[PDB]
């Protein structure tokens, strides 16, 4: 059972739309390797091609097939030979990072994400996945971000990525948007102390006035308050601190891009204060209502509405 690598190797739009191609049938019947789904004998047999060969459109094709087949839960076998997969995949990772190809790295990162979602060295694999968010390629970076999001939402590994993201905030100006996307997609699944540290560091980057990073990190505020986090993830006193700390900017009066989402994020935050402890939420409400009544004086009808 071979030549599916040669099937995906051809890239012509006449053959992608066929039912026999990798679009539909590989997702259904190719997973049943030998009549039973699934066997990684294909995976273990393609070691001789994925080692010491750097030929394009064959490494990428087998990476695509591995990414498509790996999702059909061979979970005890995955737990058994996770060490072999991790070692083979990290040497492939180092070789491709030294070489500089995109498609092979993108799909091996995707199937690495599937592997880590299905399952000490696991922490090493997690940092191996995590290190390529600041990678400049938009296809590598988006795949790595989506993979980290799928791994975390599908947690003992939140501490490492929270500390990491804080750290490349602290060293770093165009990767700031990418790690702010990481915060927007990963803030709810953090513990309370790390939520506090990320919030403090996010106000430290609120000290700057670049419109993109400020807008996307207050969108990360919107993401964290939108999910209605639990008590262990966000406490009432920390939420009170970050709602009394966010009063210090109020862009101007009529900026109309951060003002609407601003009233949205204090809306969601005060909802969370009321949901956690209703009397304290009602106690912190009057300053919000006073500032809202003040910002009905804006010349823009959208702010008013």
């Amino acid at each position: 059972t071979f030549s599916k690598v040669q099937r995906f190797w051809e890239s012509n739009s006449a053959a992608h739309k066929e039912i026999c191609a990798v679009l539909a049938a590989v997702t259904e019947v190719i997973r049943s390797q030998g009549g039973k789904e699934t066997e990684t004998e294909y995976f273990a047999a393609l070691m001789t091609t994925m080692e010491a060969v750097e030929s394009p459109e064959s490494l990428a094709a087998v990476a695509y097939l591995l990414n498509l087949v790996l999702k059909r839960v061979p979970s005890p076998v995955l737990i058994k030979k996770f060490s072999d997969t991790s070692k083979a995949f990290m040497d492939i990772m180092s070789a491709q990072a030294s070489s500089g190809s995109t498609s092979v790295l993108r799909w091996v990162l995707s199937c690495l994400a599937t592997l880590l979602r299905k399952q000490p060295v696991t922490l090493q694999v997690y940092h191996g996945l995590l290190s390529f968010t600041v990678h400049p390629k938009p296809k590598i970076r988006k795949a790595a971000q989506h993979g980290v999001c799928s791994v975390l939402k599908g947690h003992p590994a939140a501490i490492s990525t929270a500390k990491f993201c804080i750290q490349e905030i602290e060293k770093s100006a165009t990767t700031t948007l990418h790690m702010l996307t990481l915060l927007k997609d990963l803030l709810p699944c953090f513990p309370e102390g790390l939520v506090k540290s990320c919030s403090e560091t996010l106000l430290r980057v609120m000290t700057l006035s670049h419109v993109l990073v400020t807008a996307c990190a207050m969108q990360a505020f919107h993401s964290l308050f939108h999910a209605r986090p639990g008590l262990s993830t966000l406490s009432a006193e920390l939420n009170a601190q970050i709602i009394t700390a966010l009063y210090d900017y109020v862009p101007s009066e009529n900026d109309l891009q951060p003002l609407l989402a601003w009233l949205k994020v204090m809306e969601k935050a005060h909802i969370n204060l009321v949901r956690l402890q209703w009397d304290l939420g009602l106690g912190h409400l009057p300053r919000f209502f006073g500032t809202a009544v003040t910002c009905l004086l804006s010349p823009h009808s959208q702010v008013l509405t």
Binding site: T207, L208, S209, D248, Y249, P251, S252
Partner: protein, 122 residues
């Protein structure tokens, strides 16, 4: 414990962040005497020379400037510094000092608080 204001001229926008300090006035990591049009230097010391260093004793102010040219950036710098001091004295100091400083600045010049509405037209 800190305030954040902006000041615009034509296209140049200078954002000023003010806090409890030790008497240092900083723009883009450079001292205010270290801005390359030294011919137009006394325009950007106008809050300091008008108001003295005595009331700038415990103020830390940072200004970051985007866009514009050179002269428009300088006017944005002085406008942003002045609005930062006014908002700081609004939020953390009494109101009499606010109206006194505003009266001095308005009787000196009008552009240093309110911005020129005119910009480049199509």
């Amino acid at each position: 414990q800190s305030v954040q204001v902006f000041g615009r001229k034509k296209t140049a926008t200078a954002v000023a962040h003010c806090k409890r300090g030790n008497g240092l006035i900083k723009v883009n990591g450079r001292p205010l005497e270290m801005i390359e049009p030294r011919t137009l230097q006394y325009k950007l010391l106008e809050p300091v020379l008008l108001l003295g260093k005595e009331r700038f004793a415990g103020v830390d102010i940072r200004v970051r400037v985007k866009g514009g040219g050179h002269v428009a950036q300088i006017y944005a710098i002085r406008q942003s510094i002045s609005k930062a001091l006014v908002a700081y004295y609004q939020k953390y100091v009494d109101e009499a000092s606010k109206k006194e400083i505003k009266d001095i600045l308005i009787q000196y010049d009008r552009t240093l608080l309110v911005a020129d509405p005119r910009r480049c037209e199509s």
